[PDB]
Symmetry: C3
């Protein structure tokens, strides 16, 4: 009495309507359609940067942060706009709840493509369930101000746990300029999205 | 007289067949199934790099460009192959329609993972047109030629609107060499995919 | 008798139940629902970095590698930890079967967001089915060791085919530090995911 158009299908044998889906890309979890590899972005809200402090110094920066989850990888991106000219090494540190992944340093949200916040625990940014991470390195950066080149330099990144919480610690090295730069790196998360 | 297999369900109360989905991953858009955070790419066509001129000078480059949207984030990547050795700073300007996002400087296409062009207006690349916002910065780049290292240097990027249109302006600085480099940076789009 | 809730719809003119979907995001392939631009990651397994040799020198490094496919672009990322304070330049080469894409140099797997391996042939990392490619460049890198800056330098990358197989060849230039660095770059794949 009715027909079903692909990707819906009807089995006359058992009188059952099904959805056919490609299993490398889509799956069913708890009876509900989902993706095998959804994109989630955990970020500072739209043009709403986080206020960071250089350790105990009276030196601050605004930071826009995006943490993009692709498969089990996390692409970390930060845009730092320091307020104060400095020589030496500044420590910009981000703290995340060791269970939830929620940023404790400033406000971040899981953000869909519509621009709406998603009510999704950000555990997908945590490197491990067991707190045993090792990840560190350096990226080249270029400091500038008002469109003018200031300095070619570098910034370290390190992933650690302290007092049970997850830290991403960034250390920029400057020689008179304001620490104003963008950098990115990738790390792996062993936390699956199910 | 019929049943439904998950992720399809049937409610006896209201005689209604539904699709059950995970709302952080899938959603309904104007009656139709969609992703919460779809990937979209606006790019130069396969083997069809864009011809760019360095301002008013008789100096040109070919550029392959990809603009990757996920969540509200845009990852911009460019591969610039300059023709002429230069000492100084080159200005590469990309112009896009300020309402539609369409590239005015050369041909770009919205491309699916299928390898087919998608009939999608590329508004998803457009950042905030608030004229008090000056999204910009610098990235480190390496100039080379035919696999040979030439220079470690830098390139600026600046996002602006003027004359109703969206501009990405890149400025590469060279000493002696052709401007031949790849660079990427991230920004945010104001335009929700709905 | 039945009703349908969006995204399911019923056409009374032809007695057909359909799933409405947004074609730039979702599609139907061989009667099954799929994504237009799925994310796939081809990577080294967690805690199973690949052992790479510097040509025929007795010099090795361990590499975590992710190759993230979005739309038709591949984001390549490598995290290298070498052992031997290098002398000059070291060449790290990855080989992939030119038909199936499988890494022949060491163990890689297609990994879902779920944290589970996916049974997908990795053709999506191949530049073309034609077995031809021209793509080369340099990225700036920073070598470090145990949190300490060592050198700001560069790494070349080149995409080629030899004897019908696809090669990614990286040449890192160090002055007398261990090759310990991360680098990434993007390239285009003309192999559609269909």
């Amino acid at each position: 009495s009715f027909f079903t158009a692909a990707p819906l299908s009807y089995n006359t044998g058992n009188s059952t309507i099904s959805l056919d889906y490609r299993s490398p890309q889509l799956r069913v979890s708890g009876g509900a359609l989902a993706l095998t590899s959804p994109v989630f972005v955990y970020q500072t809200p739209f043009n709403t940067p986080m206020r960071l402090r250089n350790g105990t110094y009276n030196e601050y920066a605004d930071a826009h942060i995006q943490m993009v989850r692709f498969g089990t990888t996390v692409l970390f991106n930060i845009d730092v706009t320091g307020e104060t000219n400095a020589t030496g090494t500044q420590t910009w540190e981000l703290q995340f709840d060791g269970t939830l992944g929620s940023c404790l340093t400033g406000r971040m949200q899981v953000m869909g493509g519509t621009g709406e916040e998603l009510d999704v625990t950000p555990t997908f940014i945590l490197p491990t369930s067991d707190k045993s991470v090792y990840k560190q390195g350096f990226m080249p950066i270029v400091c500038s101000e008002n469109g003018e080149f200031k300095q070619s330099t570098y910034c370290s990144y390190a992933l650690t746990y302290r007092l049970g919480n997850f830290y991403i610690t960034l250390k920029s090295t400057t020689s008179g300029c304001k620490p104003i730069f963008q950098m990115s790196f990738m790390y792996e998360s062993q936390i699956g999205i199910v």
